[PDB]
Amino acid sequence: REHWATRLGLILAMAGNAVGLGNFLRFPVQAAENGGGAFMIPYIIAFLLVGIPLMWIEWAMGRYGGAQGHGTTPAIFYLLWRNRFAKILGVFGLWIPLVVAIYYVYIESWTLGFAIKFLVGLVPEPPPTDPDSILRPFKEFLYSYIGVPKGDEPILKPSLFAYIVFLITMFINVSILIRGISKGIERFAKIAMPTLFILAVFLVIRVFLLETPNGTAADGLNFLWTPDFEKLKDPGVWIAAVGQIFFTLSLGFGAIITYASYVRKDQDIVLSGLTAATLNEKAEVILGGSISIPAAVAFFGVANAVAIAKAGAFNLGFITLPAIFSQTAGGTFLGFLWFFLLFFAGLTSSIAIMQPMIAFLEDELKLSRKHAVLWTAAIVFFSAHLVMFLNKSLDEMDFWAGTIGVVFFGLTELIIFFWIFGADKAWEEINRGGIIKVPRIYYYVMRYITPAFLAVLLVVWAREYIPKIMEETHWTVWITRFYIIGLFLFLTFLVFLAERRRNHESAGT
Amino acid sequence: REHWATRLGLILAMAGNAVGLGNFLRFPVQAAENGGGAFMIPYIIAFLLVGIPLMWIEWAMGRYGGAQGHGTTPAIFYLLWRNRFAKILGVFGLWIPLVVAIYYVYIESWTLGFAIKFLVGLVPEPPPTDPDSILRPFKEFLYSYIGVPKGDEPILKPSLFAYIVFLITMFINVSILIRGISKGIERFAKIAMPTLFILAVFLVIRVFLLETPNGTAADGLNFLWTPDFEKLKDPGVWIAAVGQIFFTLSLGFGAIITYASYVRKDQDIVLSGLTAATLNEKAEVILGGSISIPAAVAFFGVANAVAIAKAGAFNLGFITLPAIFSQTAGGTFLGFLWFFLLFFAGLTSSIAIMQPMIAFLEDELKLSRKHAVLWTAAIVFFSAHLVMFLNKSLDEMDFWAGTIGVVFFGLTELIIFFWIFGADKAWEEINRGGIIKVPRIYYYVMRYITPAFLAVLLVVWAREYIPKIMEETHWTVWITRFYIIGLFLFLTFLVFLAERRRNHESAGT
Ligand SMILES: CCCCCCCCO[C@@H]1O[C@H](CO)[C@@H](O)[C@H](O)[C@H]1O
Ligand SMILES: CCCCCCCCO[C@@H]1O[C@H](CO)[C@@H](O)[C@H](O)[C@H]1O
Ligand SMILES: CCCCCCCCO[C@@H]1O[C@H](CO)[C@@H](O)[C@H](O)[C@H]1O
Ligand SMILES: CCCCCCCCO[C@@H]1O[C@H](CO)[C@@H](O)[C@H](O)[C@H]1O
Ligand SMILES: CCCCCCCCO[C@@H]1O[C@H](CO)[C@@H](O)[C@H](O)[C@H]1O
Ligand SMILES: CCCCCCCCO[C@@H]1O[C@H](CO)[C@@H](O)[C@H](O)[C@H]1O
Ligand SMILES: CCCCCCCCO[C@@H]1O[C@H](CO)[C@@H](O)[C@H](O)[C@H]1O
Ligand SMILES: CCCCCCCCO[C@@H]1O[C@H](CO)[C@@H](O)[C@H](O)[C@H]1O
Ligand SMILES: CCCCCCCCO[C@@H]1O[C@H](CO)[C@@H](O)[C@H](O)[C@H]1O
Ligand SMILES: CCCCCCCCO[C@@H]1O[C@H](CO)[C@@H](O)[C@H](O)[C@H]1O
Ligand SMILES: N[C@@H](Cc1ccc(F)cc1)C(=O)O
Ligand SMILES: N[C@@H](Cc1ccc(F)cc1)C(=O)O
Ligand code: NA
Ligand code: NA
Ligand code: NA
Ligand code: NA
């Protein structure tokens, strides 16, 4: 089995897995919608009670499974729990990352397309003037790129440029993945992560210099880091915070598991795990948080910024920020650096999200790396046409796989590892080979606190928030639901084909 | 490998394959739309120049492949032409019947649901009066069953009864298929075909007794069998006639091939093939043709009947005929006999349409019969939700797979067998074991006349008829196109997995 060549390469690859569009696009929107500093206390508590323990748990499960030649959850779940139901539940660790891949790579392709056009100066020219005279050209720029519906049909019409750039993005992901773990992912991570950090720091510095009659970058920081204790009682803030923690640390996607399955059987995961997670948190709260919000607040004031963030998920990063930059000397190039940053943030993450599918085809169906990568790319590419051409399909996939799915899977994987497989056996598996040991308190966190936290969360979620979406949606959501249910059935069938293959091999020996 | 137990069982099973909804529902509509007797000369010529030769060709290819343990076209095409492209082209012999299955079984389920309600007298009561006061209750009856859209959203809402009956229909197909070739399909065919013939003859007799001030059943017959020679110059009539010939004889669906792969290597196919095809033609022109049209013409006159047929594909058999029957003594029960007839016609055909997928999973992926049947049923059932809930999805599948697809595949399979593999070698393969030999003239038909006929047909088709559908459709057609393209990719992947399995088995020996 392939292994990570160096410890640094391991850490940077795992940091690249976690550090992504979630740090720079999702986090600021989530924090801004939920009162800035009011979002941060639940967020921090979620990092400690959920983020950290699940990270160690997923590293352990992957390392454990990798030692036996298995990097994905259909097989790994079965190793921890010898029941046919474990294989079925394991299918989610293939389904979640595949479905997320289908929209994540497409959004990643936009950052590349924007980087290209911003570099060559093929951007909108605002009148040299109210905010809307500045923002509108950039709104139309995004709208023409992804092809937002101009009528009442729920159909998107991406530009030819956007489509070709998606193909190129897919090509770039394949070029890295096809070279494997050490010579592809690990090697790229060593080049990508320092670069990414450099760009982000520069952007933070450049944004900290923003100043207008409406305020400064410092105002944006104070809004993000000023605690509001009268919001700790709102369930909505906790749900948003835990969902961000999952999304940001790549947890519940079966993808930390798969990466960890290339860690050598006795190699450390306690310090490595903690370090990869802390690296992500710094890139998130210090870098991601210091760019978008402070810039928006400096130009529009706190109240307007919050309204912008609420407007959409992509408004702040694809419209507002580049519009703001356009009013600053060298702002088009700064727009380029921002989109180039997002692209490397996306790319280092999308190779991670597609690897579980690759690992499954290699490990369980005995495909070569070449074939596993190409077939995986083929499924993601073909499937992405749904997200490219059907308005709101992206939203539906992100809800079922990237939002609900990950929390459910987080709880599932913990129960299987710490309850079914055995708490003391799990505790010993995590700690084996550790450069440091997991603090004793975290045994009781993992066994009792974390599962109860997630279970209560999911209950409050399904009671007071999901019935508002099962009745209040356009019929076209069923196209996406139909298709991704079909993907789950497809993956179940492959797991079935893999158990049959394993049986025929065992018979002929 | 499984084989047909008896020659009679073989013939009746192959007759059941061919004799179906196409004989009783499709043929009358096609003939009525295309001028009755004006349709019949092209139809007869198509039977002789296309129907017969392709039938012998498909029996031969299946018997040939079966001798080597292969019943489907990905492998069989490769045996006749040792090129990677033959496997890819072979995928259509899995894709066409699977896509057709997805809508054919659902329509079959309607005949069962109607049979049930007509038996128990849970039918509409017309006022005891213009034609529309009689027809409307039956139109609403069909519309409430399949759930035709009442607004402007392209969404169907099938009754709970229709849905459960679909599940039962799937269950009934599985119960037969899971018992295999001789103990399932062949056994059922021996029971189903005489029954079906009996019902049809009775219905023909009962319809021949229909008489109203508007005309008699004899008027309907004269319209169907009175030649119009000024229509032999219209390409549209020839296209309709050849498409019906394909659909009716089950040709181009990879399904005659698969059935024939259970015929013993030296067993006759010339007489058996001709007999199965003549049996279908009798059930079509004599039985199918003598029920719907003569009844419609007897009650409404020739001109009104033609208009009814043009109204839709299901109008004549699901609305008009039962409405007409309702005006006759014992007419509700006669409605039941009609729908019971359609159901057995559908059932004997849908077990045939799903067998290529079963044969592929057995032959190439080494699945047991149980698993192959259950997984096949699972894909058809899941996939049928598209046809059940999206208005016009059925139409789109029937065009690409059941209409264009079969003619393309007919031409493809002939070129591969009679041109690539070798005309003299093909001619000898067909004739080997024959109780009679194929008339010498048919060598030149198969080699020269048939492929040129189909090629010209496809050209005239794609030039003057398909651009009117690539521009003139609602955007929702892309949902279906997207999904069935995804099915083709899925099947290509399985063919890929099968070649990999074959290679690993050959290495370990
Ligand atoms: C049904 C699934 C596959 C159908 C083929 C669709 C391939 C994409 O089609 C392409 O989309 C681009 C972006 O909108 C357009 O600019 C191109 O003109 C168009 O050819
Ligand atoms: C990495 C570069 C990707 C190349 C994709 C370019 C396709 C752009 O597309 C074309 O751009 C032209 C610009 O003159 C326009 O005139 C055309 O309307 C447009 O179709
Ligand atoms: C699930 C979505 C499947 C992809 C089908 C959309 C591809 C339609 O194909 C083409 O798309 C382009 C952009 O609309 C345009 O060139 C044309 O309008 C259209 O023919
Ligand atoms: C859920 C939040 C818990 C995070 C606090 C962890 C800090 C570590 O806490 C320390 O752990 C050591 C090893 O177990 C002990 O020797 C110390 O007494 C203890 O203070
Ligand atoms: C691809 C075929 C689409 C079938 C859609 C049929 C169901 C449409 O029903 C829709 O369901 C939505 C989601 O629960 C609800 O929000 C809406 O009230 C309703 O319009
Ligand atoms: C998205 C693909 C699977 C979604 C589940 C749909 C299962 C069908 O749903 C059923 O449809 C019947 C017929 O319309 C209704 O009568 C039932 O109330 C409904 O539960
Ligand atoms: C083979 C028999 C299939 C059983 C399916 C029956 C489901 C019918 O469905 C129910 O029928 C009731 C009749 O009283 C109606 O009152 C209900 O509205 C309807 O939901
Ligand atoms: C491709 C189609 C996927 C199937 C999705 C439709 C299933 C919607 O599910 C249910 O369908 C029933 C009939 O509309 C009703 O009970 C409800 O409106 C709906 O919730
Ligand atoms: C394409 C339509 C052709 C159908 C006509 C076939 C009738 C058989 O025709 C006969 O075939 C025999 C064997 O080859 C010959 O001995 C006879 O001379 C010939 O008349
Ligand atoms: C599931 C996502 C649907 C994407 C649909 C995008 C293409 C819509 O384009 C449609 O194409 C039809 C078929 O060629 C044409 O008949 C219509 O002119 C056009 O509206
Ligand atoms: N953690 C990534 C998202 C992600 C990456 C990799 C994954 F495997 C899953 C999810 C981000 O914040 O963008
Ligand atoms: N020949 C069948 C249709 C059909 C049956 C079986 C098949 F395998 C394909 C097509 C009919 O006329 O209803
Ligand atoms: Na992250
Ligand atoms: Na990343
Ligand atoms: Na037929
Ligand atoms: Na039949």
Notable characteristics:
binds sodium ion; two-stranded antiparallel ribbon; binds 4-fluoro-L-phenylalanine; transmembrane helix (chains A, B); mainly alpha; Na/ntran_symport (chains A, B); globular; membrane (chains A, B); binds octyl beta-D-glucopyranoside; 509 residues; 22 helices; SNS_sf (chains A, B); 2 strands; homodimer
Write up what this structure looks like.
The structure is a homodimer of 509-residue chains. Chain A is an all-alpha fold and 509 residues long. Chain A has one domain (1-509). In chain A, 77% of the residues lie in helices and 1% in strands. The first copy, chain A, has a two-stranded antiparallel sheet. In chain A, a hairpin with a 2-residue loop joins β1 (211-212) and β2. In chain A, α9 runs antiparallel to α16. The two termini of chain A are 21 Å apart. Chains A and B meet through α17 and α22 of A and α17 and α22 of B. One sodium ion binds at residues 16, 19-20, 345, 348-349 of chain B. One octyl beta-D-glucopyranoside binds at residues 157, 385-386, 389-390 of chain A.
